[PDB]
Design an enzyme around this catalytic site. Structure first.
Site, PDB file in Angstrom:
ATOM      1  N   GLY A  19       0.840  -1.187   0.000  1.00 36.14           N
ATOM      2  CA  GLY A  19       0.000   0.000   0.000  1.00 36.14           C
ATOM      3  C   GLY A  19       0.873   1.234   0.000  1.00 36.14           C
ATOM      4  CB  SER A  20       1.652   3.342  -2.067  1.00 39.96           C
ATOM      5  OG  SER A  20       2.388   4.476  -2.504  1.00 39.96           O
ATOM      6  CD  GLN A  22      -0.536  14.273   0.728  1.00 40.68           C
ATOM      7  OE1 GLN A  22      -1.079  14.195   1.830  1.00 40.68           O
ATOM      8  NE2 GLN A  22      -0.649  15.340  -0.054  1.00 40.68           N
ATOM      9  CD  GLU A  93      -3.849  -8.159  12.547  1.00 38.71           C
ATOM     10  OE1 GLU A  93      -4.315  -7.125  13.079  1.00 38.71           O
ATOM     11  OE2 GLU A  93      -4.414  -9.266  12.587  1.00 38.71           O
ATOM     12  CG  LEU A  94       0.739  -9.626   6.241  1.00 36.91           C
ATOM     13  CD1 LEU A  94       1.044  -8.442   5.337  1.00 36.91           C
ATOM     14  CD2 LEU A  94       1.676 -10.788   5.931  1.00 36.91           C
ATOM     15  CG  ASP A 130      -9.276   8.297   5.838  1.00 29.79           C
ATOM     16  OD1 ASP A 130     -10.068   8.751   4.977  1.00 29.79           O
ATOM     17  OD2 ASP A 130      -8.069   8.041   5.594  1.00 29.79           O
ATOM     18  CE  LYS A 132      -9.575   6.403   2.039  1.00 34.17           C
ATOM     19  NZ  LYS A 132      -8.904   7.531   1.354  1.00 34.17           N
ATOM     20  CG  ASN A 135      -8.539   3.579   4.911  1.00 37.01           C
ATOM     21  OD1 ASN A 135      -7.508   3.192   4.359  1.00 37.01           O
ATOM     22  ND2 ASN A 135      -8.767   4.856   5.192  1.00 37.01           N
ATOM     23  CG  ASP A 149      -5.007   5.148   6.596  1.00 35.30           C
ATOM     24  OD1 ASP A 149      -4.488   5.873   7.477  1.00 35.30           O
ATOM     25  OD2 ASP A 149      -4.976   5.435   5.382  1.00 35.30           O
ATOM     26  CB  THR A 168     -11.833  10.278   0.550  1.00 36.33           C
ATOM     27  OG1 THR A 168     -10.462   9.865   0.656  1.00 36.33           O
ATOM     28  CG2 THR A 168     -12.327  10.065  -0.875  1.00 36.33           C
TER      29      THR A 168
END
Length: 265
Positions: A19-20, A22, A93-94, A130, A132, A135, A149, A168
């Protein structure tokens, strides 16, 4: 508060990117001492007091403090925190199943897990702020979901908070759009948006530009399109309608949402 300042690479090996955002990237990783796997979130620090790039230490510390509190099957957990001059690195946690139109049984199966996780958070006076689809992740793609997140999450000790908080546009509540004091109710609006998309594949307030979307949110400019909802139950629509309510005081709470006839067994 300070974090572990040894080199994270001495204790973990990183792999594929998960994940990636800002100012953050998430890498799969493996702890050398145990072989157990995690997700390492590298958050870029602000370099100066007035810079706009990077995340302020106040914001990083808030996210870490909130994450340290939570232990629930439907919310991501925090394992360790490292830092250096450029990044804070959360060892999380993965959650490897990726991001979450469905039947109502499938939708409510996921929604119930989302509600259980939000019930836990709101019981601790934690607003996520947040929520959405991006997430809401799965552990294995009836899968187990994990809310992720916590970069906007805040403790709500006085019923509301008055800060620089804005997510968002498609998913924020009218009080966010209008820069009003914010409480747990904003998450419940976002859940209503999520439920609308879950059942229909369509976004209830989405306009052609961000400003249009925000104007639609503030005006509660949505409707159930018959082409999308013709086989959806009226009780499902009732659930959404009682969340997409402009007045936060009149919106269903998380406890209300769990007792609503579409959800309650």
């Amino acid at each position: 508060t300070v974090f572990r300042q040894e080199n994270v690479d001495d204790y973990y090996d990183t792999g594929e990117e998960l994940g990636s955002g800002q100012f953050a990237v998430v890498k799969k990783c493996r702890e050398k001492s145990t072989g157990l796997q995690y997700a390492a979130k590298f958050i870029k620090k602000r370099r100066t007091k007035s810079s706009r790039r990077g995340v302020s230490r106040e914001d990083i510390e808030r996210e870490v403090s909130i994450l340290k509190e939570i232990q629930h099957p439907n919310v991501i957990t925090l394992h360790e925190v490292y830092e250096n001059k450029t990044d804070v690195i959360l060892i999380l946690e993965l959650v490897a199943g990726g991001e979450l139109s469905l039947t109502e049984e499938e939708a409510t199966e996921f929604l119930k897990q989302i509600l259980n996780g939000v019930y836990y958070l709101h019981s601790l006076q934690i607003a996520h702020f947040d929520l959405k689809p991006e997430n809401i992740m799965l552990l294995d793609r009836k899968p187990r979901i994990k809310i992720i997140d916590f970069g906007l999450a805040h403790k709500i000790d006085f019923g509301n908070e008055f800060k620089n908080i804005f997510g968002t546009p498609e998913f924020v509540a009218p009080e966010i759009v209008n820069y009003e004091p914010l409480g747990l109710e904003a998450d419940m609006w976002s859940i209503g948006v999520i439920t609308y998309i879950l059942l229909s594949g369509a976004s209830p307030f989405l306009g052609d530009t961000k400003q249009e979307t925000l104007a639609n949110v503030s005006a509660v400019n949505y409707e159930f399109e018959d082409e999308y909802f013709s086989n959806t139950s009226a009780l499902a629509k009732d659930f959404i309608r009682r969340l997409l309510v402009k007045d936060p005081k009149k919106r269903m709470t998380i406890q209300d949402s769990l007792q609503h006839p579409w959800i309650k067994p």
